[PDB]
RNA sequence: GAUCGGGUGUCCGCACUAAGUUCGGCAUCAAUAUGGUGACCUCCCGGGAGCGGGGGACCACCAGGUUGCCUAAGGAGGGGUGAACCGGCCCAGGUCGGAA
């Protein structure tokens, strides 16, 4: 059913490098993450001496576990492009290789949003995947170096992620409102350059068992 | 550039920019990352001559070359146009000066958006090299002595020297001041007052002793067990060292030697030093959790958790240690590092603190809360291991071991350690 | 507060996971603008030779500036051989042309 995609990516980056800025280590944890999800669930793409295309179909989406396989393809190509942005400050040709990993990180997230459009997934992962696509499309069209196509898919990602917050409890709205606030600083920069031109449960209903007022009875 | 604030070093906002759209958003977090923590990307530029700071807020880190050229022209027009207000000693020259730099910045910003489409460092060069070679030979880490020396060509560049000063004695002095302020971590400690606060939930006080092989975790744990008993505290030694030979009999000789000095007869009739041991080969997070529940039930004010010594590059074992300290939630994580280690004092604490926060599953993870600097009686002035440790980590040297007995436990004299290190 | 409900985590040749620990296999795209290199083909022009001046054609590799109907991923990485005759170059002697 459920998948907290934002909590998945944030606690895997702080634990595997991105707290100190290691995109090379985070991508390697992403590749070993996917190899061991593939070897456990017997979902290998190729065999020895041949290759076969991995197609995560709709039938195997009941596991609530194969969405993390395609997401580890989206987070691997995203982590490689952010590492190539640090190596493109001294090798400006690395930027061409950066932009080929971000177009296939939205393509995995657009193929992962179409998989969540299945009726076997709740109304939480269809919409975490819809606006994780709109966040990677605003970062690719921000790295296109056009300031207008950058605020178009960031205000789209902000309006999607805010439409998801209003629809549920304000406690579950925290995850969707944490992500509108998460992409809100980038929207103030592209607006500055367009117009430039058993748990413990207590039986508290046993403390309520007491005598009636015995003042009228004396 | 969405943001730009220029204040003095005395903490006085002179001029700020946040765009015509709303105004004045995030000038305090801008100061904090840029001046407070240095002694939307939020960077800075320091005018050390007139005590100014030029904090800026921008995104797209690849536009950092044009953001630096805009801070340089704004810094050159600010210190020239207002040279009279900022060159005086009185803080009433800046309180009474009018810094109407909005039309000058909108012109320097709109014009830098079209390019996109005394003491110098040569004088201070030779003495910053003799001071960096003195820190390194006095056992300050090789790169700690390189950032230390560059924090001082920055601090004094532009500044005029005293009536009797040379190039040598200025970088030699502001390097002592940037060294005492970094050997002054942003932390404090207490005593019985702190176990009265650990009794706000009626629970003991659990300290975790971690570190690399052979530094003195078990021996200084016994100097602190004698120091707690001397203050009238009962201490339960949790023996979670199950990766060695004689790691429990070492702690059982410390408990026999300490329950001799502080017996029940000379304490009131109750046990004050007791060893909690489960043998060898057992889990070190399971013996530790059993000893916190045992000291709660048997009334021990302190639990001193001894862990096994390990390296800094062990992914399946710094995982089990970082998960131990994350989950056990100890009151004070005490990294134990010897005063004999050289450049490894930086790599030990950086990997020990990176592990404690990686394999942690909290929002703000439980990091190392202090340092115990052991084998201090062995360097004799090669004291730069105390600087390398409180430099990277902003944690204090809680104790300084000065020998092998229980009485060789000192507080840190951090003033005379920088005076010995900065005197060459 | 005597027995004791009600319920867990120590014991297992256990069940499933998948940050790491370790060695292999297979595999690793293409188009543009600019310059360069090496070869080869075909013309003029000068000479007593070794040779010298000049016009095109084609091939491979190469540097680096934009890119894609490009990837499961495809660096404008680092190295080595370049020999028994086949890369280029600098080429002792020797050697061929020359009166030199
Ligand atoms: N001179 C001197 N020796 C010290 C000091 N602190 C510890 N030692 C010595 O260093 C040695 C290491 O002892 P120990 O406490 O077992 O270190 P450890 O870190 O627990 N080793 P392990 O990794 O096995 O747990 C002992 O001989 C101890 O006496 C100190 O401040 N000065
Ligand atoms: Mg020990």
End-to-end CA distance of chain A: 62
Q: CA B291, CA B236: separation in Å to the nearest integer?
A: 8
Q: How was this structure determined?
A: cryo-EM
- Taking an 8 Å cut-off on Cβ atoms, the answer to whether B361 and A189 are in contact is no
In terms of Cα–Cα distance, which of B366, B373, B363 is closest to B352? B366
Collect contacts of A33-42 with beta carbons under 8 A, ≥24 apart.
A33/A72, A34/A69, A34/A72, A34/A73, A34/A76, A37/A65, A37/A68, A37/A69, A37/A72, A38/A69, A41/A65, A41/A66
Q: CA A140, CA A96: separation in Å to the nearest integer?
A: 12
Query: How many contiguous H segments (helices) and E segments (strands) does chain B have?
Result: 16, 13
End-to-end CA distance of chain B: 45
Nearest chain A alpha carbon to B360: A15
Q: CA B216, CA B408: separation in Å to the nearest integer?
A: 12
- Residue B144 · residue B387 · CB < 8 Å: yes
In terms of Cα–Cα distance, which of A83, A140, A145, A85 is closest to A108? A140
- Residue B128 · residue B153 · CB < 8 Å: yes
B396: CB partners within 8 A, 6+ apart: B185, B187, B188, B189, B370, B371, B390, B412
Query: How many contiguous H segments (helices) and E segments (strands) does chain A have?
Result: 8, 0
Q: Could you say which nucleotides of strand C lie within 7 A of any protein CB atom? A: 7, 16-21, 24-26, 64-68, 70-76
- Count other Cβ atoms within 10 Å, centred on residue B88: 14
- If 0-12 CB within 10 Å is exposed, 13-18 middle and 19+ buried, where does residue B322 land? buried
What the block records as the tokens of B261 is: 């000095």
Stated resolution in angstroms: 3.7
Q: CA B74, CA B53: separation in Å to the nearest integer?
A: 12
Please report which ligand is nearest the Cα atom of B399: 1
Q: Give the single-character DSSP code of A213.
A: P
| B316 CB less than 7 Å from any atom of strand C | yes
The integer distance in angstroms from the CA atom of A205 to the C1' atom of C6 is 19
The integer distance in angstroms from the CA atom of A50 to the C1' atom of C26 is 8
CB pairs under 8 A between A and B: 28
In terms of Cα–Cα distance, which of A179, A83, A166 is closest to A129? A179
Pairing of strands B397-401, B370-374: parallel
Q: CA B256, CA B9: separation in Å to the nearest integer?
A: 57
Which nucleotide has its C1' atom closest to residue B316's CA? C20
Q: Does residue A34 belong to the interface with chain B, where contact is any CB pair within 8 Å?
A: no
- Residue B386 · residue B185 · CB < 8 Å: no
**Separation in Å, CA A67 to CA A4, A59, A99, A141, A164:** 11, 12, 24, 25, 20
In terms of Cα–Cα distance, which of B363, B248, B396, B269 is closest to B237? B248
Q: CA B421, CA B210: separation in Å to the nearest integer?
A: 28
- Count other Cβ atoms within 10 Å, centred on residue B52: 20
User: Residue B45: helix, strand or coil by DSSP?
Assistant: coil
Q: CA B342, CA B139: separation in Å to the nearest integer?
A: 6
């Amino acid at each position: 059913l459920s998948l907290e995609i934002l909590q998945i990516i944030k606690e895997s980056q702080q634990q595997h490098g991105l707290r100190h800025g290691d995109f090379q280590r985070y991508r390697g944890y992403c590749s070993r993450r996917q190899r061991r999800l593939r070897k456990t669930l017997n979902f290998k793409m190729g065999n020895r001496h041949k290759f076969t295309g991995k197609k995560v179909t709709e039938d195997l989406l009941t596991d609530n576990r194969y969405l993390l396989l395609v997401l580890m393809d989206a987070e691997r190509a995203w982590s490689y492009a952010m590492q190539l942005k640090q190596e493109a400050n001294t090798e400006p040709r690395k930027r061409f290789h950066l932009l080929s990993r971000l177009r296939k990180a939205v393509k995995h997230a657009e193929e992962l949003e179409r998989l969540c459009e299945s009726n076997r997934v709740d109304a939480k992962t269809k919409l975490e995947a819809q606006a994780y696509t709109a966040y990677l499309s605003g970062m690719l069209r921000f790295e296109h170096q056009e300031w207008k196509a950058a605020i178009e898919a960031f205000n789209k990602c902000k309006t999607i992620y805010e439409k998801l917050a209003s629809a549920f409890t304000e406690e579950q709205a925290v995850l969707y409102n944490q992500r509108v606030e998460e992409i809100s600083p980038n929207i103030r920069y592209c607006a500055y350059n367009i117009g430039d031109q058993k748990p413990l449960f207590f039986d508290l209903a046993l403390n309520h068992v007491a005598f009636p007022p015995l003042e009228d009875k004396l | 550039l969405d943001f730009f604030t220029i204040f003095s070093k005395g903490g006085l906002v002179l001029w700020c920019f946040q765009g015509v759209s709303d105004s004045c958003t995030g000038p305090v977090n801008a100061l904090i990352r840029s001046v407070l923590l240095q002694e939307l990307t939020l960077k800075y530029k320091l005018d050390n001559q007139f005590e100014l700071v030029f904090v800026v807020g921008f995104q797209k880190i690849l536009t950092l070359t044009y953001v630096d050229k805009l801070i340089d022209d704004v810094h050159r027009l600010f210190r020239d146009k207002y040279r009279t207000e900022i060159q005086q000693q009185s803080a009433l020259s800046l309180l009474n000066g009018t810094f109407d730099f909005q039309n000058d910045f909108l012109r320097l910003l709109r014009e830098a958006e079209e390019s996109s489409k005394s003491l110098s460092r040569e004088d201070m060069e030779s003495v910053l090299d003799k001071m960096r070679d003195h820190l390194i030979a006095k056992n300050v880490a090789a790169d700690i002595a390189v950032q230390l020396c560059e924090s001082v060509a920055n601090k004094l560049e532009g500044k005029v020297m005293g009536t009797f000063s040379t190039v040598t004695s200025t970088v030699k002095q502001a390097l002592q001041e940037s060294l005492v302020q970094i050997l002054q971590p942003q932390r404090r400690v207490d005593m019985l007052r702190d176990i009265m606060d650990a009794q706000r939930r009626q629970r003991p006080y659990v300290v975790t002793f971690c570190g690399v092989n052979g530094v003195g975790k078990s021996t200084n744990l016994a100097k602190i067990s004698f120091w707690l008993l001397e203050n009238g505290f009962s201490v339960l030694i949790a023996a979670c060292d199950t990766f060695r030979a004689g790691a429990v009999e070492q702690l059982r000789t410390h408990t026999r030697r300490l329950s001799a000095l502080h017996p029940p007869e000379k304490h009131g009739g109750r046990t004050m030093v007791q060893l909690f041991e489960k043998g060898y080969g057992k889990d070190a997070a399971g013996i530790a959790m059993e000893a916190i529940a045992f000291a709660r039930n048997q009334g021990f004010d302190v639990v001193l958790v001894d862990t096994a010594g390990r390296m800094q590059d062990n992914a399946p074992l710094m995982t089990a240690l970082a998960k131990l300290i994350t989950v056990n939630t100890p009151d004070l994580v005490l990294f134990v590092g010897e005063a004999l280690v050289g450049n490894e004092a930086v790599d030990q604490l950086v990997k020990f603190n990176r592990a404690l926060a990686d394999h942690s599953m909290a929002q703000t993870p439980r990091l190392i809360d202090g340092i115990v600097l052991t084998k201090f009686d062995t360097i004799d002035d090669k004291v730069g291991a105390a600087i390398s440790m409180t430099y990277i980590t902003s944690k204090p040297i809680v104790f300084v071991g000065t020998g092998q007995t229980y009485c060789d436990l000192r507080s840190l004299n951090a003033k005379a350690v920088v005076a010995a290190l900065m005197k060459a």
